[PDB]
Amino acid sequence: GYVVCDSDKRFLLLFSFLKRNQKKKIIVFLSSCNSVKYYAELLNYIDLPVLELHGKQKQQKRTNTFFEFCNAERGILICTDVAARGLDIPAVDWIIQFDPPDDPRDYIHRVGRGKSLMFLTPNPLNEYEFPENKIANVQSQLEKLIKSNYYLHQTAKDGYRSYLQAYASHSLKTVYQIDKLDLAKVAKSYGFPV
Amino acid sequence: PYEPLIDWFTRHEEVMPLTAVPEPKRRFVPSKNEAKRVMKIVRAIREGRIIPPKKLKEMKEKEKI
Amino acid sequence: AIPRERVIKAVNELIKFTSKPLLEDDEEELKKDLQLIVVNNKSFTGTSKSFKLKLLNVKHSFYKPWKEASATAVKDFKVLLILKDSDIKKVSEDDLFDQLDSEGIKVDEIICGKDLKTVYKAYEARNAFISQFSLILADDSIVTSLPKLMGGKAYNKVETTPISIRTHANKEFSLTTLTNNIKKVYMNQLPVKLPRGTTLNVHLGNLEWLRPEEFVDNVELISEQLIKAYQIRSIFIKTNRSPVLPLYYNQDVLDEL
Amino acid sequence: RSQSEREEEWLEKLYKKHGDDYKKMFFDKKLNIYQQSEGDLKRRLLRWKKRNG
Amino acid sequence: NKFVRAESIVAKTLATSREKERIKRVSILEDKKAKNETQHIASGKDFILKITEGLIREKTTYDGKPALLFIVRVRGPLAVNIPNKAFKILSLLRLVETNTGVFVKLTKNVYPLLKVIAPYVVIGKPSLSSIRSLIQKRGRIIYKGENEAEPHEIVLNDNNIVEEQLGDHGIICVEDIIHEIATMGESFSVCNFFLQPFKLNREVSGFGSLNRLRKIKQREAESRTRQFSNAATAPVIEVDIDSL
Amino acid sequence: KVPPTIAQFQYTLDRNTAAETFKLFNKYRPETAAEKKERLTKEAAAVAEGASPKPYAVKYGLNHVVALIENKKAKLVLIANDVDPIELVVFLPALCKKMGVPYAIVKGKARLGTLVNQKTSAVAALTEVRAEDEAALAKLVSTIDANFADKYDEVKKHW
Amino acid sequence: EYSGIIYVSRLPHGFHEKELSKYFAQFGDLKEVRLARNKKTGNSRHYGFLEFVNKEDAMIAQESMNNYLLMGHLLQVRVLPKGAKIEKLYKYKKRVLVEKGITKPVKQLKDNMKQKHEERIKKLAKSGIEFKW
RNA sequence: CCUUCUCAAACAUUCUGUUUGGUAGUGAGUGAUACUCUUUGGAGUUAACUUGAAAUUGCCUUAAA
């Protein structure tokens, strides 16, 4: 149904899932195609071998990687909302959209084709009670990791920005620029909101 | 004549930095000015016009006795 | 010699007790996993509260699958090496990987005695440093100095308290003495503390590791080394707050009281 | 126009470590300090290969 | 009469905590070494470190042989107040004053007491010239003044003063005192309490331009040429007294 | 008679706090022109025959600092009260308040110069810090926010 | 109003009644000083109370020590109103173990162990577990 | 505003192996049944977790001027 998490504990909770669910086939959805260019660099760097799908990469790569995910057994991909339209795989158990969606109505059609949940503190199936203590302590490791690579500083820069630009180009009363930037920055690990 | 300065603008703290200037590579990479100086002294040692710090001890171990 | 049949029957009852009818694994998974073998005596080390970890020899490694699928678990297994002030000046991490990837163990971080008293001296920085790691190794010399440098919270567990490793061939440091002793502690030894009281549990760890026939060999040799060295009272196999499994029961040690 | 005595020797260090794996080479820290991109790196390599092998 | 800052008053206690616990620790292991109850302690023997001059650290065990030492007062460590066990030994050796030397013989009874005062003293076996030059350069004698005054400590100027105070023990002159000090004899306990302590001048000996920098250079040379072991199996640091 | 944003100075940091500031700050000395030169000659000797990490030292140009506040790089800022044109700094305590950056007016413009190899400094700031002193800094900050920011909430008012 | 009794917290590691009495003596004649400690082992809870014979002395000490960075953690001092006196804080040393053991005969405790062991085998059967011997 | 108990033997040489002994910890709190002793008092143990070193009262002098 949904999980309630703050903008600090947002990617913290996501990273906590992907390590334990390495055996399974789960789907992570983002709003921007410039957000997945960050996550599919971090997780491949910290050795959770995820797959990368976005608009900014070439079509033959977009085909030959997504094909490999269909024929896999243990795999995991990161793809956007708009790029994953029409090509859905039954080989799935968790459909977990991370960002707020494009259409609040069309997402219902996206599910009933897998288990669905959202992430909302600023904003059928059951909610999920969440332990505060057992989140992974990889934040200061990431804070050291961001300010010492440049490439991951730039991809985080255009991860944070593109996410927040898509957050402002929404239509709902819930998703209308309420979330403070002192929390949203630590999702992409910053001392200042870029 | 002497009103207290009512801080009508500093009351509210800023979240983001003022400018969105992209950080340069050189702020993360080892400095190239340092590399320039080092590779200048390197030349000076090959030419023999700067005597190395290791031999400078040997020039005073033999002299001023 | 203890009966192996009662050990098989014990672990089978542990299988039945673990097969019983949230999105994170806060307590449910630990109470499922964590086996502990209790050993009772009339006053273990009765007056001296030393923090020595008795390295009980075991045929089969439980640290190995603890590595392989702590990779899947949220809390990762990483190998720490506390050394002395001349060692890091002499030996890098790359030489450790050169000689320990051959069998397949990985040294995560090497740590000086300087680092625990300057950079990791802040209490939250210290706690969050050590609690990340499960295997704590310390060169023989530094071990006695370590209750002060890493504090008491590092000693409340069995994981976070260090293991005394010898690195000195006739007081001279050698890499080889480290290379083979890291192997012996890792695959052939299980550490456990000795409290000043009566009760002692041995943290065998997760029930899921080493198919129950192997678990018999673990328990067998543990009793083969704890009853020979010390006179003891009682032994119980216990998963977290089960009705206990009385394994060994002695009536000839109590006569001296 | 040629390449520098150190630059060449630093390029040898890369090729003997990775060969033609520019991605791994670009994410390396021990040899690739000044975080030069693949295009910059491979250009230098193609040049170094022309004076050597 | 001055105000005492808070930082200093906590620093003194925080350092004496280390010193009280350290002295008790050495006291326990040395008590358990003498009673032959060496069942479960760190080490049941005695090492001596001899640091010479590029700084070679030797590790040699202490023999049962009686040796001749010249203990020199240091002033160390920083925030420490001396405990009861330090007040006692330094009263017996009469080394309450800083920059002050004394001669003692080292035996199996003397050596355990040496580990207690090791952060306060710098020890070592002197040579014949170190002893002989020291006595002919510095020397005090506490005896009566003109007619009334007692506490005059003057100087080893004469040999007839040596006659009047010692005499019948076989000692006649200052060089004979040097003989019974360099070579361990009968009259050593007689003349050792006759030259009570020595008055060594301090190093550098100033606060100013050149003297502060020279004190800085020597102060960093201290921690290199001397270590505080703090453990119950502390190897006794012996240094060159001919150089010192 | 003083307008409130002037003599928002003169209400400086106290004795015990001040020394403890320098206790931290003297740990973060920039290399001297002599030292920098020898370091590089040490490099040249070595690198002519046969790795390093980025070095923390405090930051010291008025420019550089006014860059650093407002960009969030700054953590602590030290601002000397007596300056030839006061105007050269009068905005600075407010700017910091506005970017939420912890600041303290220190006494002795020369005293800043000490910690930085220069004659004077007007302003120095500790941006990045070593691992061990990270806690030391953040506590100092709090100490400063108590005895300076909270103690003088009325520094923006009263002539 | 306020009273001579003071509250001090965030005390340094090893800043005891000896040094609380000695340092705050320089502010003036103190009446009565305490420090809360653990009973399991004799060490400070890092907070204590002390009283002055002068109320004005209490407020002067508070003015000068309210935020005092002292070896890794800043001293917090608070005045107390009329009432709320210094009551029950005892000097607790390191408490040692006392060896009360044998007294009862070996045959009594043996059959006590037999009773507890047979009931122990009769305990697993109460909740879904069957185990031999 | 000082910085912390930075290694010893007995046997064995497979280029270092075995055995023996060595550590008294910031405080405060959350915590699911077991262990022996004691005779009612908790005595001492046994998983785990929280935390900016957090907190409201358990009966020697040249390291100076």
UniProtKB/Swiss-Prot annotation, chain A:
Residue pairs linked by disulfide bridges in the UniProt entry: none
Post-translational modification: Phosphorylated by CDK1.
UniProt motif Bipartite nuclear localization signal: location: 9-25
Mutation effect (F119S): Decreases the amount of 40S ribosomal subunits at 37 degrees Celsius
Domain Helicase C-terminal: 1-146
Localization in the cell: Nucleus, Nucleolus
Domain of life: Eukaryota
Result for mutant: R110A: Lethal in vivo and leads to less than 30% of wild-type ATPase activity and a 2-fold lower KM for ATP in vitro
Described purpose of this protein according to its UniProt entry: ATP-dependent RNA helicase involved in 40S ribosomal subunit biogenesis. Required for the processing and cleavage of 35S pre-rRNA at sites A0, A1, and A2, leading to mature 18S rRNA.
Quaternary state and interactors: Interacts with RRP1. Associates in the nucleolus with the 60S and pre-60S ribosomal subunits. It has also been isolated with the nuclear pore complex.
Note in the entry: Transcription depends partially on SET1.
Similarity field: Belongs to the DEAD box helicase family. DDX18/HAS1 subfamily.
Domain notes: The Q motif is unique to and characteristic of the DEAD box family of RNA helicases and controls ATP binding and hydrolysis.
Name this polypeptide is given: ATP-dependent RNA helicase HAS1
Organism listed in the record: Saccharomyces cerevisiae (strain ATCC 204508 / S288c)
Full-sequence portion shown in this chain: 267 to 481 of 505
From Swiss-Prot, chain D:
Keyword Nucleus: yes
Chief location: nucleus
Coiled-coil blocks: none
Biological process according to GO: ribosomal large subunit biogenesis; rRNA processing
GO cellular component: nucleolus; nucleus; preribosome, large subunit precursor
Modification Phosphoserine occurs at: S2, S4
The UniProt record lists the keyword Phosphoprotein: yes
Superkingdom to which the source organism belongs: Eukaryota
Role according to the record: Involved in the biogenesis of the 60S ribosomal subunit.
Family, as annotated: Belongs to the NOP16 family.
Protein name: Nucleolar protein 16
Classification of source organism: Eukaryota, Fungi, Dikarya, Ascomycota, Saccharomycotina
Gene name of the record: NOP16
From Swiss-Prot, chain E:
Coiled-coil segments: none
Residue intervals passing through the bilayer: none
GO cellular component terms given for this protein: cytosolic large ribosomal subunit; nucleolus; preribosome, large subunit precursor
Positions where Phosphoserine occurs in the chain: S205
Compartments where found: Nucleus, Nucleolus
Major place of residence: nucleus
Gene Ontology biological process: exonucleolytic trimming to generate mature 5'-end of 5.8S rRNA from tricistronic rRNA transcript (SSU-rRNA, 5.8S rRNA, LSU-rRNA); maturation of LSU-rRNA from tricistronic rRNA transcript (SSU-rRNA, 5.8S rRNA, LSU-rRNA); ribosomal large subunit biogenesis
Note: Present with 7720 molecules/cell in log phase SD medium.
UniProt-recorded name of the protein: Ribosome biogenesis protein RLP7
Provenance organism: Saccharomyces cerevisiae (strain ATCC 204508 / S288c) (Baker's yeast)
Gene it is expressed from: RLP7
Interval of the full protein contained in this chain: 53 to 317 of 322
Curated annotation (Swiss-Prot), chain F:
GO molecular function: RNA binding; structural constituent of ribosome
GO cellular component: cytosol; cytosolic large ribosomal subunit
S-S pairs: none
Ribonucleoprotein among keywords: yes
Record-level GO BP terms: cytoplasmic translation; maturation of LSU-rRNA
Keyword annotations of the record: Cytoplasm, Ribonucleoprotein, Ribosomal protein
Record's subcellular location: Cytoplasm
Subunit and partners: Component of the large ribosomal subunit (LSU). Mature yeast ribosomes consist of a small (40S) and a large (60S) subunit. The 40S small subunit contains 1 molecule of ribosomal RNA (18S rRNA) and 33 different proteins (encoded by 57 genes). The large 60S subunit contains 3 rRNA molecules (25S, 5.8S and 5S rRNA) and 46 different proteins (encoded by 81 genes).
Note: Present with 238000 molecules/cell in log phase SD medium.
Family: Belongs to the eukaryotic ribosomal protein eL8 family.
Role: Component of the ribosome, a large ribonucleoprotein complex responsible for the synthesis of proteins in the cell. The small ribosomal subunit (SSU) binds messenger RNAs (mRNAs) and translates the encoded message by selecting cognate aminoacyl-transfer RNA (tRNA) molecules. The large subunit (LSU) contains the ribosomal catalytic site termed the peptidyl transferase center (PTC), which catalyzes the formation of peptide bonds, thereby polymerizing the amino acids delivered by tRNAs into a polypeptide chain.
UniProt protein name: Large ribosomal subunit protein eL8A
This protein's encoding gene: RPL8A
